[PDB]
Structure formats: structure tokens, C-alpha cells
Paper text:
Trimeric coronaviral spike glycoproteins form prominent features on viral particles that are responsible for the attachment to a receptor on the host cell and, ultimately, fusion of the viral and cellular membranes. Encoded by a single viral gene, the mature spike glycoprotein comprises two subunits, S1 and S2, which mediate binding to the receptor and facilitate fusion, respectively. The recognition of the betacoronavirus SARS-CoV-2 host receptor, the cellular membrane protein angiotensin-converting enzyme 2 (ACE2), maps to the S1 C-terminal domain (referred to as the receptor binding domain, RBD), while the function of the N-terminal domain (NTD) remains enigmatic. Here we show that the NTD of SARS-CoV-2 spike binds biliverdin with high affinity.
Details of the biliverdin binding pocket in the crystal structure refined at 1.8-Å resolution. The metabolite fits snugly into the cleft, with the pyrrole rings B and C buried inside and propionate groups appended to rings A and D projecting toward the outside. The pocket is lined by hydrophobic residues (Ile101, Trp104, Ile119, Val126, Met177, Phe192, Phe194, Ile203, and Leu226), which form van der Waals interactions with the ligand. Biliverdin packs against His207, which projects its Nε2 atom toward pyrrolic amines, approaching three of them at ~3.6 Å. Pyrroles A and B are involved in a π-π stacking with side chain of Arg190, which is stabilized by hydrogen bonding with Asn99. We speculated that the protonation state of His207 in the biliverdin binding pocket, and indeed of the tetrapyrrole itself, may affect the interaction. The residues corresponding to Asn121 and Arg190 appear to be strictly conserved across the entire sarbecovirus subgenus. Using cryo–electron microscopy and x-ray crystallography, we mapped the tetrapyrrole interaction pocket to a deep cleft on the spike N-terminal domain (NTD).
Author numbering: 14 to 319
Amino acid sequence: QCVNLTTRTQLPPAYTNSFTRGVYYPDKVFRSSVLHSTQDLFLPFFSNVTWFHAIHVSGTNGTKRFDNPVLPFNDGVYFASTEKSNIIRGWIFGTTLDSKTQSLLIVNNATNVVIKVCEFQFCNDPFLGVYYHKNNKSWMESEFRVYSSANNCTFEYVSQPFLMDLEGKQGNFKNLREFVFKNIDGYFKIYSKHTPINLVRDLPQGFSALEPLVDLPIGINITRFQTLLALHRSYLTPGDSSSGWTAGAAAYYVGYLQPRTFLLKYNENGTITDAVDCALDPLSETKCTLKSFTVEKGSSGLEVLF
Ligand SMILES: C=CC1=C(C)/C(=C/c2[nH]c(/C=C3N=C(/C=C4\NC(=O)C(C)=C4C=C)C(C)=C\3CCC(=O)O)c(CCC(=O)O)c2C)NC1=O
Ligand SMILES: *[C@@H]1O[C@H](CO)[C@@H](O)[C@H](O)[C@H]1NC(C)=O
Ligand SMILES: *[C@@H]1O[C@H](CO)[C@@H](O)[C@H](O)[C@H]1NC(C)=O
Ligand SMILES: *[C@@H]1O[C@H](CO)[C@@H](O)[C@H](O)[C@H]1NC(C)=O
Ligand SMILES: *[C@@H]1O[C@H](CO)[C@@H](O)[C@H](O)[C@H]1NC(C)=O
Ligand SMILES: *[C@@H]1O[C@H](CO)[C@@H](O)[C@H](O)[C@H]1NC(C)=O
Ligand SMILES: *[C@@H]1O[C@H](CO)[C@@H](O)[C@H](O)[C@H]1NC(C)=O
Ligand SMILES: *[C@@H]1O[C@H](CO)[C@@H](O)[C@H](O)[C@H]1NC(C)=O
């Protein structure tokens, strides 16, 4: 199954700013119109998050990137993709990421979401592949080169089937897909949010809390993860299995959760509509001390009594 891709070019690591993204609902308490202070694993506001690309730049020896490095998991991850052609397909999570230990696979293979925990012998360069057939103008799922063996499976879920749109699109990124992953006491917890966007780079500023998606009772150690991307092949990408491919444009972003005290605002319906990262700056420390999003002195004059 495994193919080590060639023709990637060198590019320095790149970064962007997380603004106030990545807040998620840290519990399932029923709330209405209250602020709640809680210490949990959060992405600090205005974090320097790492920016990864799938891109094939025009020109002679134009930059060609298909970024699927193995990355640390640390205490949990914020993951965001900015998409127009459904290039990010999922992730693998584990330790050795080989047959010596169990790993978690979460992947959209164009017809199903697949969630499996096995002793996987993952490929060094795992990827999925789409083929564009010129004569009927059809984009079809063609390659699944993620692992060469899978043994002793302890968890398997396969969603109801679908047919995902695989067309490489023109224009700006249109879909923002955000995830928080935590691995707590044997449970792999996923929070997520999908948002319409219209941008070519960076992350949008507007606030959105990620909602609980699922808790997987899988009981495995996780210290590393690796993103699964789909490449494209066609009559325009001549070469062999390693070289005859291109990347449809996509970007994704990785930040790391750490222990933080956040003040969360729940509106009339229990939606988290704003948050303060208490340790961000003196203004945020002031808000958390006052248990308030507003710090301005009032004009009642009643302070002198109490
Ligand atoms: C990681 C890759 C990934 C892909 C390729 C993806 C595609 C994708 N997700 C959708 C909905 C959705 N997708 C999911 C969840 C998932 N769907 C998945 O493929 C995976 C792996 C998860 C989560 C682990 C959910 C719950 C919805 C409904 C969310 C909504 O519409 O608000 C839809 C149909 C509605 C739309 O266009 O917004 C697409 C095309 N989403 C992703 O997160
Ligand atoms: C891919 O490269 C790695 C490291 O260079 C090597 O160990 C592995 O055997 C290669 N696999 C294939 C299929 O070429
Ligand atoms: C983000 O972190 C990297 C790694 O240390 C650093 O090189 C880069 O300058 C940082 N960017 C900003 C804007 O602080
Ligand atoms: C995706 O995975 C499911 C579950 O393993 C499998 O049944 C299905 O055939 C796969 N899709 C394709 C296009 O191979
Ligand atoms: C397009 O043609 C290819 C090659 O004949 C075929 O595999 C594919 O199923 C076709 N797609 C459609 C939608 O007919
Ligand atoms: C399968 O994995 C589980 C968890 O790692 C382990 O307890 C069990 O012994 C394994 N079975 C094998 C390796 O045959
Ligand atoms: C995970 O690793 C820790 C120490 O690194 C160990 O105590 C624990 O038993 C491991 N769990 C599994 C399921 O292998
Ligand atoms: C809250 O719920 C009501 C209906 O119960 C709905 O009309 C409203 O849009 C929701 N959101 C806000 C911010 O009020």
C-alpha cells in the first residue's frame, strides 16, 4: 500500500495567530444567562499556532507542499482546517504509530467516516488519493494508502454511507472545520464546529464555541498524531506512484491546549457567546477578578455605602 511521495520542495515552517478561537463546552451542565469560571485544558488566546499547507505553486520548480508531519499531541490539540475541496480527511493518533501499539484512526474515505482502534502498521507517508478522469469530468476516490496491516482491532465504527464531493474547486476557502481533541482517563473526547468562510489565509476573528461531538471509550495512550490528506492525480500529473500527483490547495492549523482559567459567558439558551482567557493580560485578569465582562465603574454613587 505504502508509497513515499517525491517532488515536495522545501519551505520554512509557518505560523498564524489563533485570535480567540478554540473555546469548547467543558461540561454538560444545563445553563442560562450566567457566567461560569472554570480551569480546564484550553488554547490560550492569541496563540502562535503552526500553519500547514497542501499547495502546488505555479512556475518552474514552483513550491510543492503536502504537509503531513507527525506532530506531538501533548495535553490535547486544537485543529482547524480551511477548505474548499475536502482535502483534509482525518488523523491518526497514537504513540509508536506502528504495529507495536494500538492507534486510533479517524478518516473520511469519501463514502464513510471510519473510526478504528487497531495495531496499525502505518505508512511512513500516509495519504488518500483522488483521480480526475478527463473524459467524463469525474473526480473519484482511487487510493487509500494509510497502513499496510491492521491487527487486533479493539474498536470499530463505520458511519452510514454518503458520497462526498471530491471536485478540486477554484476560488477562496469556503469551509472552516475546527476540532478539539483531548485524551482523558481512557476517553478520546472530540469537540467540533463547522463555519462558512470566504478567505485565502489566516483564521476568522468571530467567536464560536466548539460543541461536543463524541467521547470514544478506547483506553489507549496518545502522544503523537498525523493528519491524513488527499492528493490529486490526473492526465495533468504525469509520473510514477511517487511523483505523478499534485496537491489541491488546503491549509490546516495546530495549537496546543494547556491548563487555563477561563470565564465563559452562557446566554439565555446555554450557548457560549464569549470568553475571557484570564491570564492573557491585565484587562483579562481584571475581568476574571470582577467576575464580569464589563469593568467600567458605574454612576449610581452607591459604592460609598458598601
Ligand atoms: C476531517 C475531515 C472532514 C471532512 C472531509 C468533512 C466534510 C464534510 N463534513 C460535513 C458535515 C459534518 N461532518 C461532521 C463530522 C465529521 N465528518 C468527517 O468527515 C469527520 C472525519 C468528522 C468528524 C470527526 C458532522 C458532525 C457534520 C455536520 C456538522 C454541520 O453541518 O454543522 C459535510 C457536509 C456538509 C457541509 O458541506 O458542511 C462535509 C462535506 N468534515 C470534516 O471534518
Ligand atoms: C519510505 O521511506 C522510509 C524511510 O526512508 C523507509 O523506511 C521505507 O521503507 C520507505 N517505504 C517505501 C514503500 O518506499
Ligand atoms: C511563532 O513560534 C515560532 C517558533 O518558535 C517562531 O519562530 C516565530 O517567530 C513565532 N511567531 C510569532 C509571530 O511570534
Ligand atoms: C471506506 O471505508 C469503509 C469501512 O472500512 C469501507 O466499507 C468502504 O468501502 C470504504 N470506501 C471506499 C471508497 O473504499
Ligand atoms: C468515469 O469514467 C471512469 C473510467 O471509465 C469510470 O471509472 C467512472 O466510473 C466514470 N464516472 C462516472 C460518474 O460515470
Ligand atoms: C490486543 O490488544 C489489547 C490491548 O492492547 C491486549 O490486551 C490484547 O492482549 C491484544 N491481543 C493480542 C496482541 O493478541
Ligand atoms: C501508557 O503509558 C503509561 C506510562 O507511559 C503506562 O503506565 C500505561 O500502562 C500505558 N497504557 C497502555 C494502555 O499501554
Ligand atoms: C435563543 O432561543 C430562541 C428561541 O427559544 C431563539 O429565537 C433565539 O434566536 C435564540 N438565540 C438567542 C441569542 O436569543
